[PDB]
């Protein structure tokens, strides 16, 4: 199967900036009829893909003129004259030349803006957790940018890597910042044994990791 590769994996570009997505093929995908069949598809979150370009350059009906394509035997690129809110999504290159036909790796498109420092927070368990016989420790990080975020679960001088949940949120619209909620599930037999719980998070904006902790002993 012809292998098709997309670069970059992510393409942060602010509004109105030129956007360039490149797609390459493991083999030439030209055809005898004078055309090479390459199409570009765009998928918004929680929606089915949509056709943008086909046969490399030919533009689909009903799509803005800003989109354009170009390429040759094994190198192709997509161009957006101006970026807008609707333009946000994932872009795939599709080759329709050699059976079987394969999709590109996907090139997520993003809008860069003034990076904001993360607002870290830590929430200990609740009475319901104690009654149920469990202890859930969750760390919150809201309105941060860019994806240069790392969270370390250091507890009373001990770094614990087991049972760590990685769940971040895609960029929003109003704020265009991400979020990152990490959780650590603790049992009652183990929850009370330790004394200090801390959530170390490091971000590009603040070189020194931000520290938020609470002590069980109180």
């Amino acid at each position: 199967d012809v292998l098709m590769t997309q670069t970059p994996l992510s393409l942060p570009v602010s509004l109105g900036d030129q956007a360039s997505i490149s797609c390459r093929s493991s083999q030439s995908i030209v055809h005898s009829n004078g055309n090479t069949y390459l199409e570009w598809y765009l998928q918004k979150p929680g929606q089915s893909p949509k056709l943008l370009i086909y046969k490399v350059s030919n533009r689909f009906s009903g799509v803005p003129d800003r989109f354009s394509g170009s390429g040759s035997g094994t190198d192709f690129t997509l161009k957006i004259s101006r970026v807008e809110a609707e333009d946000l999504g994932v872009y795939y290159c599709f080759q329709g030349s050699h059976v079987p036909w394969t999709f590109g790796g996907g090139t997520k498109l993003e809008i860069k803006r003034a990076d904001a420092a993360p607002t870290v927070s830590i929430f200990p368990p609740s009475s319901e957790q104690l009654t149920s016989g469990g202890a859930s420790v969750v760390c919150f990080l809201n309105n941060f940018y860019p994806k240069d975020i790392n969270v370390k679960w250091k507890i009373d001088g001990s770094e614990r890597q087991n049972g760590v949940l990685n769940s971040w949120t895609d960029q929003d619209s109003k704020d265009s910042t991400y979020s990152m909620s990490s959780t650590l599930t603790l049992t009652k037999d183990e929850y009370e044994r330790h004394n200090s719980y801390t959530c170390e998070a490091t971000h590009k904006t603040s070189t020194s990791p931000i520290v938020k902790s609470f002590n069980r002993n109180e």
Partner: protein, 218 residues
């Protein structure tokens, strides 16, 4: 023109599922039906194609033997059968109309979600959380609402009649061991949180479960 896909499916590991794509408004037998798999993580992977007029079918190397295509000409429907469902097979599957070399994937199905799991329907266990007592109170603070131990998707979280919609940051569900969870935190004035009442609503249509647990200061 319109491609209508079947409903969502939840099946146990090792079983086999059969999803259907129904095309109307065009010559169903003269257009290839393309099947695409989108794992929740990332990427579009074409499974294969079938021309309903004939029996011709193609499969990508990764799916040869995993998927089998069948089509009914009398009822304008095409079927894909997945055998030996593992946990990796859980994804959203799309059906698209394609005519090689002439027309691209201009029309797509709504998308069918398949989930492979050993669990059964379970109501959510909403555990509202509040800022820890050992935490300085400042002008702006973050609230806490936690939902866990629920299955399957989805679960909608909202405030009382949309009391505070903007500024909320929900997060995608994740699996601890087998069950899904969810977190949601919002920013409210420090002077309004204790005075005004803030609560997070939970709805689980799959379990027909609705919950409402207000969070009060510790």
């Amino acid at each position: 023109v319109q491609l209508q896909q079947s409903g969502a499916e939840v099946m146990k590991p090792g079983a086999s599922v059969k999803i259907s794509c129904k095309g109307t408004g065009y010559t169903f037998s003269s257009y290839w039906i393309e099947w695409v798999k989108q794992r929740p993580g990332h990427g579009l992977e074409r499974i294969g194609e079938i021309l309903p007029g004939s029996g011709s079918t193609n499969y990508n190397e990764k799916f040869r033997g995993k998927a089998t295509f069948t089509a009914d000409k009398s009822s304008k429907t095409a079927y894909m059968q997945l055998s030996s469902l593992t946990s990796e097979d859980s994804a959203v599957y799309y059906c698209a109309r394609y005519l090689p070399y002439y027309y691209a994937m201009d029309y797509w199905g709504q998308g069918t979600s398949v989930t492979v799991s050993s669990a059964k329907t379970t109501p959510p266990s909403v555990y509202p959380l509040a800022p820890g007592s050992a935490a300085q109170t400042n002008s702006m603070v973050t609230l806490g609402c936690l939902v866990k131990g629920y299955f399957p998707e989805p679960v909608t979280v909202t405030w009382n009649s949309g009391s505070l919609s903007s500024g909320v940051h929900t997060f995608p569900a994740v699996l601890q061991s087998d069950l899904y969870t969810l977190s949601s935190s919002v920013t409210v004035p420090s002077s309004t949180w204790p005075s005004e009442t803030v609560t997070c609503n939970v709805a689980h249509p799959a379990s027909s479960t609705k919950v409402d647990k207000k969070i009060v200061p510790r």
